[PDB]
Each structure stands twice: as structure tokens, then as C-alpha cells.
Ligand binder design. Structure first.
Ligand code: MG
Ligand code: MG
Lengths: 288, 288, 288, 288
């Protein structure tokens, strides 16, 4: 049961990526039980990162671990291809991309051709990043049956949808990307790619371990807490909230996100800490 | 009644922008009655264009006309600010941006702050580009009441939604961006920003003129034809279809779009021409 | 350009239909220029009415006029058929039905069979009542080409959707059901079936006559005020608000709606009346 | 972990409910391990049933068992109240209702008042039937904190939505209604109210018992086959397919559904039976 972290990309006050905080943060997650790192995913501001930034994120993480899934999506297939050729030169877990996005009403064959070109050029295992709420498109198994897919990261609240990939694509690994369904994913899928692993890795790791021991109720109870957190963070902007919580829960600074993904202001950050305090107490009591 | 064209960005077979075709195309549209050009909009592959490409599009068009609305949106407010400072040095109609996109569940204050920063730095009239089907966010008048908005381009099938801007924001110009509602927009709003002006400008211009003369039925009949075209193009990918039709209807080449906005293949292009032929006949009979 | 009214169904405080009030109201409506009355539509609480209540509404109204379109939808086709046979013996304009509702994921063929059965038994002109937002289903022209459809009431905010019927179904009368698009419908379709005709019939009849005279600015001005009323009524429940407003604008009691469509409390009614006061004065200053 | 069955309502070819078939079916279901029967739910064509048909279903079933949850929803609260007073004199598990439906844009307070009225008169435990996809409304815990709710059936694909009830409503029993999430519900909620219990009760009772024994791999394997059945039944209409399958799997006639919920034709029934043959053999090879 794989616990993958869509690692955040630390930015400094001027919006420049801080590769040193990225490395510090990555080491801590690995050390705390995270099995692999999804680089440049939604949580790492993927589509907000230029091609050079995506590449620099992979280079910096490659010093910490080779268990990296490199997300290379952009609205210019040339830049996507460039990153792929670059990644073929490295020893990583695989390359990934979300579907084309923004543009509405694109034919389905456009989605199929995009990935088909990634597969033609890549020498790495293909990981499909399916996030309909973000891209506006759901990638069905129809399209994937041709491609040499190794894994699918499915950010979707419908578990049967994730499970349908398992069913229709023998051999492919499926991981659900929702924080509020971790428990369920660990009881049916090949793992999770959950953003909350950035600030509470030991908690998600504890869920997996409790499930391996057969203590579901303990795992479920931890999910209640995770879900209550989810509700609180929505108000402040989840991704921007995570930056604050990584400092609070893990003891080191990971900077700020980059606008339009606005950082929480000091009044907002303090308001968040006050509001999650009761949940933090409960968590650190059941996990440590 | 303003007829604005979200001009396409011509790309060559290698995906490099062709500024010469852009200039040729722009001259023809102006010559045929288009009042202003929306640069780097959805139809011009805005979010697919790098900041340098957005700038090069404005520079090239600035030789043809100063009636330019410069769209500068990207998922890095620094790059957005850069383009804005650059545009303040020029004599244009204004600067515009769609809302932040891709990232779902961003607080509303994030949308308000993004535009508020554009307004703080820009010395040009602010044009709000509202396209919910593409960005995932609807920009309500609540947020715009603070900002110094000159115009709103509202791509939305609900005309009452566009008309609500008119109502709630005295003095602001509102233009609807739907091809299938042109007729209605010309009878209630300040104009249109319609993608179909790229290949049938004389037709949309004719609608406005027939309406100024009081010949609504003639304008409406032209809308029937436009709508039938809309249905046919959806199948092939509207934006990609437009590139083919600009050659067919206007007699000059505007290249191809850039993948993931895939160009129509030769079999698809011929299939499109065969399928719209009856509509072209009818159009050129009522317009010339 | 026709103005059809989806007349409300007056109920007394015990949830019993008030036939006397229904007749007095219809009488006023026809006198004020309403072209026809649509019985048991959404505004008349159609699906909340029993077989017999639908029947007794037609009977009550048949003592007042012959310009009636009889909606007979329910989730038991046997009951729909009974109502159809009942109306076959009456000299009214036509019979109508919205699509099956509530049940999600019903195959399209079910929608076709529902209507084919109505057409097979009805000796009256068929009126299709399309209200996707209420039923969860959109009736496409595909299905309608097989049926002897005379008219379509399309309650849809996409005016292009209503306009598409005109194109694919030659000779069929198309009316749009939105109050916020009345102006546009009178400029392109066969008419409107708007709930607001219940309390401001003269206003909508004035829009029709002003447009007939080429005074579009004055008709659009009235539309702006209608759309402002629409925003206000949503807080209170539109159908429920209409009852209070009929009394307020027309001078007679039309009773109360029947819960789950709750009547406005005394307090809510005064609140409503205060909000619309400024709009009522501007309206009564332009109409008459 | 409880397995509640939303029992279908058998109709004869004339659209008359077949009480004898209803009793024979319920009898088999209880014998096969079903914990309780939910009467007049969606699967039982609840909203398509008249006041009297709902009543006669409860009466028929009351001669067979006392484990009945009585759903009484209609769009006339007077009728809902009558049904509630009727059931007050019967020794059943509880009374239930889905939210008002059809009418869009009804204020939330209407939903609260609908339920407050039921609670004010019912002398039975209250069961909230939440089915946003059918009614167009989601009942939030906000409303439920004021009511003496004993249970909630949540037909929702977001398992997190069902789980949120457990959190905000201590002591309330929560069941999920999806067939495709049965496995997950049995691992986190109080049970399931799944339509498939009608034709494969032993399969779902087996999942419950396997999970009770810690054999999750075997319960998930059965879930995979259930989800494949779900895909197949959608083509034909799930509720309508269930009738054919009950006969096929259980050995007795449960008649036909009543149109607009059309029965499968002879041809469609054979087609359905062929598609599910491979799945039936794999199922009957794992159950018994
Ligand atoms: Mg009579
Ligand atoms: Mg008895």
C-alpha cells in the first residue's frame, strides 16, 4: 500500500522557488514513512510552474530520492516533450501528466493524442494524473487501453470511479488523490497520493500500519480527524494552508505559495492555528 | 455596438508563432468591419502562450491597430505584472485577464486580490474576461464594484447574466462572448467578442448593420446559419476548425493551432469543408 | 409574439384549491392581454397536484376561456393517459407534459415512449414542456421529430437551446419560459410562457406592444426591472412570492401555495413588499 | 453493519400493484439475511406511487415483518402527514422521507419546515432519505441538528458525505445507498440500503459476513463483480432491470415496473440475461 506525497513547491517572498526548503521537506517526509514523491502535481503548483521550474524541482529532489513521479503537463506539447526527453536521462519512478486543461469542449481524440505523444517519446513508465474538477476532463479507460500505463493517480470523490480503473486496466496501479477517502483507498486501491501527507505524514502512515494490523476502527478514527481538518482548510485555501501547517506540524519553514495561490496573511495564519488546535491535540495523542 | 474579434494566434508547423500571418489576418478583419481586437484570448490560445509570446502578439498587432485589448492571464502573478508594466508603455484600448484557473476551490478573496493587483499597477482601462466554463470561476459584480473596470467580456450562454453586469455596474461596457447569442447581444449589450469573427467577420458585421436598419428578421436568419455552423465545428474542435475556415472564407493561410490544441488533419479538414459547404453557399448569398 | 401565462393554482389555508380565486385571476389575465393560459405548469404546482386537482383546474378555467394548454405530467402514465382522454372531449388549445422526473439515469428511450404514448391517444395538438432544471432531462429534437409536436415551452436560460428547436422542427411554435429573457424571446421565438405574467401581465404585454412598434429601448428598460424583481423574489421562493405580489399588484386574493411550497409568512410578505416598492413605482410609472 | 433492502414494488401488466408478489419477495429477502426493508424508496418507485399505494405497500409488508422503514414523500405535505398519522398506529422501525423535489430554487428553510412538520406529528423514529441526484437538494447537518433524527439513508457517491453525518450527528445511524460502494460502507457506516439486495441478497449478506470475519479481499472481490453488474444494468434502466434479475436469480415473478419506468421488452430482457451470464456464474461460484 503506497503512500505518495504530492510535495508542495516552496517559494520565497519574491515567488522564486526555494530548492533548499524543498530538499529539507522531502527528507522529512521520506524519513516519516512517505514511499514516493509526486513532483509538480496540483499541490506543488504544477501548472503555475514554468518548464524550467518543473525541471529544477526534479533535479533538486533527485538528490534526496529517486522515488519520483515527474509531472510535466502544460498547454504546449513542445514544452511537455522537452521535459520528457530530459526525464528519460534520469533514474526515476516515472513521468506523469494531467489532461489538457482550461480549453473547454476539446474533442476526446485530443486527449488521446496528447498522452499518445508522451508515450511515444518517454522511456519511463507512464503515470496518468486524472483530476476532472481541475482540468474539466475525465480520462476514461477507453483511451488508456492503448497506452503503456503503469499507474493512475485519480483525484475524485467517487471511489467506484477509481476502482473502475483497477477493473478495466489489468496490471495498472491506481491511487486515489483525495484526503477525505484515504482510509478507503488503503482498503481497496494500490495507495494514495494525498496532499495532507505534506503536514501530517506520520498520521497517514499510521493509518496504513493500523490497517495492516487489522485495527480499522483506529484507522477510521484518524480519518474523522483528517476530514474535520479538510473542512477547516477549505475556508483559507487548502494549498496555501498546507504551507502554514507544514511549519506547525513538522517544525521547519517551507515558505509561501505563489500568487494567484495567495499565501495566508498573518491574521489568517493565526486564525487557522487557533481553529485546528483541538484537532492537533487529538492527532498527536493517537499518533505521537 | 462594438464587434470585437478574439483573434487567433497563427502557429507554423513547428508551433512557433507566425507574426506575419497575424498581421495579415488582423488587417483583413479591420478592413471587413471588426472594431477592435482582443489579443491572447481563449481563441488566440492565451493560456497556452508563454509571457514572451503574449508580448510578441501585442507588438505585432500594434503595427496594424491600437484598438487592442491585451489579455495577460497566467498562473504566476509576477509574469502577469510584467506584461502589465510592459503594456502601460503603449497606446492601447486596455488590458484584460481571465480569473485564476485550474486550481479548484480557491477562495473568492483570491480572485479579488488577483485583479486588485492588476489594477494597482496598470495605467490602462481594466477589462474583465469572465469565462466560467474555462476557469471554473464566475466573477460576480461584488468583486468588480471596487475595481476601475471599463469593460467586461462575458463568455456565457445566460444572457441575463451578462445583462446583470450592465445593471449592477453603471458605466461599464459589457460584451457577450458567445457566437450563438450574437444577435441578442447586439440588441441589448455594448457588443460582442465572438470567435467566429475570425472567419466570417462580414457576416457578424452585416448582422449589426441590418439591426441598425431595423431588419431584425434578416439578422436573425443569419444567426440561424451561425448556430448551425457552431454545431458542426464542435465535433472537430472549434478553435482548430477556425484555422481551416479562415483560409476557406478569407482566402489566406493562418497556419495551425498548437498541440494540445491539435490541428485538423487533412481528412478532417476536407470533411469539415464538405459539411459546411451548404451553409457557406447560404451565407455568401445573404451577405456576399 | 404570444404571451402565455403559467397560471398559479390558488389554495386556501387548508391546502384545498380555490376555484373561485382561480377563475377571477384568469379573467383578469385575459382582460389584460394574456394570449393563453398554461394550466398545471410548474408555476401552477403541476407535479404537486393530484390527477383530480389537475382535472378540476382545467374544468374551472374552461368556464372562463377556451385558450388553455393542459399540462398532465405525473410519474404514472396510466394517470397521464386518463387525463389525456378527459381532455380529448374538451375544446382547448392543446395538451402538454414535462418529461418524467425524479428518477435519475432513466434511458432516453423511456422519454421517447412516454411521449409516444401521449401522442397515440391525444386528439389535441401536443405541447412539449422542456424544463431540464426541474426534471433532470433535456428533450432533444431527436425524440421530437417522431412526434406530431405543435409547440414547445422551453424553460431554459440558454436562448440558443430554444432557438435550436425552431431550426430542427419546422412549423413548431417555440416559447421560452424564463422571466429574465422575455425581451429576447419576443425578438426571436413564437412567444413566452413566463410566471411573472401572473402579477405584472400589463408590463409583459407592454414589452410585446413596444417591440411591435420598434421601441426596443423601452422594452429592454422594462426587462431590466423584471430581472431586478427576479433577484429579489429568489430569497423568498419565487412561486410563493408570486401569490403575495398578485394581490399587491392586481388587487385580489389568490390565496396561498401549498407546502412543501410554503407560503410567505406575514413578516416575509412585508419584507418582500418593501424590497419591491422602488421597483413597483418605476414600473407603474412606465406602464400606463 | 446492517443490510436494508429498498424493496421493489411489483406491478402487474395493468400498472396495479401485486401485493402477493410483494409479500413472497420480502419473505425471501428476510430469509436470506436482509436486516430490514425500506418501503417506497426510489427502488420501490416511491414518488410514482399514490398516497394509497404507499399505504397498501406498508400494509402488505406488515403481514410479513415488523422491520419496516416507511418512506412517505410527496409534494403535498397534507398527504405526507396523513401517511405519518396512519403509520403512527403501526409497530414498525420508523418513518422516512426524501426532500421536496422537482421544484428548483426552493429556499433551504422550506426543506427544514417540511421535515419539522413530519417530526412534530410522527411518534416513530425519523429517517432522513438524502438523494441529491434525485431531488436536486442536499440535506445538510445544519437542518438535521434541530430534528430528532434516528437514521439517515444517504444515496451519494461521495463516501465522505455519508461519513460527515456520523461526525456531526452523534448517535445517528448512517447508511449509504450506493450499490457500487457497499464494501466501503460496511467498513465505516452503520450499513447499506442498496437496490441490488433485491436480486443478490446472499451476495451482499456474504460481503457483510466475510468482513465480519476479516476476509476483506473476498468481500472486495464480490464488490468488483457488483460494480460490473452496475455498468451493465445502466443501459437497460437499473430499476427496470432489477425486476428481470429478481426472477432470474431468486426464482419467482416480481412482475413489471410501471411506466414512465418502462419494463424491459422480451428482447431487452434476453439481451440483459446474456450480458450478465458470465458475472452470474462467477458470483454463484463464490456465494454458496
Ligand atoms: Mg363547466
Ligand atoms: Mg394486515
Amino acid at each position: 500500500m503506497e503512500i505518495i506525497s504530492p510535495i508542495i513547491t516552496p517559494f520565497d517572498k519574491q515567488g522564486k522557488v526555494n530548492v533548499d526548503a524543498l530538499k529539507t521537506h522531502a527528507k522529512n517526509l521520506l524519513e516519516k514513512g512517505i514511499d514516493a514523491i509526486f513532483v509538480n502535481g496540483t499541490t506543488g503548483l504544477g501548472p503555475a510552474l514554468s518548464k524550467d521550474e518543473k525541471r529544477q524541482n526534479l533535479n533538486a529532489l533527485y538528490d534526496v530520492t529517486h522515488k519520483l513521479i515527474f509531472q510535466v503537463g502544460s498547454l504546449n506539447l513542445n514544452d511537455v516533450m522537452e521535459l520528457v526527453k530530459f526525464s528519460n536521462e534520469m533514474d526515476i519512478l516515472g513521468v506523469s501528466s494531467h489532461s489538457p486543461y482550461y480549453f473547454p469542449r476539446l474533442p476526446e481524440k485530443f486527449l488521446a493524442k496528447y498522452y499518445e505523444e508522451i508515450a511515444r517519446i518517454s522511456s519511463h513508465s507512464l503515470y496518468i494524473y486524472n483530476y476532472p474538477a481541475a482540468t474539466g476532463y475525465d480520462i476514461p479507460p477507453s483511451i488508456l487501453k492503448s497506452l503503456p500505463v503503469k499507474g493512475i493517480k485519480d483525484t475524485n470523490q467517487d471511489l467506484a470511479h477509481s476502482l473502475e480503473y483497477k477493473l478495466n486496466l489489468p496490471g495498472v496501479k491506481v491511487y486515489n488523490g483525495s484526503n477525505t477517502l484515504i482510509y478507503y483507498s488503503l482498503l481497496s486501491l494500490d495507495g494514495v497520493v494525498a496532499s495532507f501527507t505534506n503536514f501530517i505524514p506520520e498520521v497517514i502512515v499510521k493509518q496504513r500500519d493500523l490497517i495492516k494490523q487489522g485495527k480499522l476502527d483506529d484507522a477510521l478514527r484518524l480519518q474523522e480527524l483528517i476530514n474535520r481538518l479538510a473542512d477547516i482548510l477549505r475556508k483559507y485555501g487548502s494549498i496555501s494552508a498546507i504551507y502554514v501547517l507544514v511549519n506547525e506540524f513538522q517544525g521547519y519553514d517551507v515558505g509561501y505559495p505563489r500568487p494567484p495561490i495567495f499565501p495566508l496573511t498573518d491574521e489568517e495564519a493565526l486564525s487557522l492555528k487557533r481553529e485546528i488546535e483541538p484537532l492537533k491535540r487529538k492527532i498527536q495523542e493517537l499518533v505521537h
